[PDB]
Amino acid sequence: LRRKAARLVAAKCTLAARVDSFHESTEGKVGYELKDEIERKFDKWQEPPPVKQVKPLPAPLRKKRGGR
RNA sequence: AGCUUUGCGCAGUGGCAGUAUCGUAGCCAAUGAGGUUUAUCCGAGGCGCGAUUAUUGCUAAUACUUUUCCCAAUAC
């Protein structure tokens, strides 16, 4: 997942650098929000897979079409 | 006043393929999906789940017997 993470980190770093180039969000709210988003998307990737049901065999046993 | 371009609908005439089509009050996505090549470069859907003849509807093929009429003198 490291390249998928690197793309996201690069995008959010571009956003933070554009934020900082005008010296706005001096205290650091935007960076904290972007880091929180990055961490949440990282946890989503590593979140354990959902519970998935087993499909039983249908039945051991009707008209059919015909054309081109 | 014709000619013509783009996108969207309604149709008609064809051709091609059934290992693919569709759904997504599930998740993520141009504040970036995905990146094997062309990476100080490209640029959209992707994942999971679900339905199924790997889209779905029709149409057709897989049979003859009920009834309802009857006998009689030109005679003790």
Side-chain angles (χ1 to χ4, degrees):
Chain A
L1 288 171
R2 281 181 179 170
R3 306 188 73 96
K4 190 192 262 78
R7 290 192 297 260
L8 177 71
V9 167
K12 299 299 175 184
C13 286
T14 312
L15 292 181
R18 292 166 183 176
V19 159
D20 290 337
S21 71
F22 309 88
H23 304 93
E24 304 296 327
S25 178
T26 63
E27 154 204 30
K29 293 330 288 163
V30 174
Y32 263 12
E33 292 176 359
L34 294 178
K35 184 167 177 283
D36 191 68
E37 175 180 359
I38 283 172
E39 294 297 331
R40 278 200 290 93
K41 295 171 91 71
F42 285 0
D43 289 286
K44 179 59 70 178
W45 296 346
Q46 282 145 138
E47 181 172 359
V51 185
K52 303 194 281 195
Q53 43 194 200
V54 178
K55 189 167 260 77
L57 267 52
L61 183 60
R62 52 177 185 80
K63 316 156 87 202
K64 285 160 93 284
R65 72 179 56 86
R68 183 212 42 259

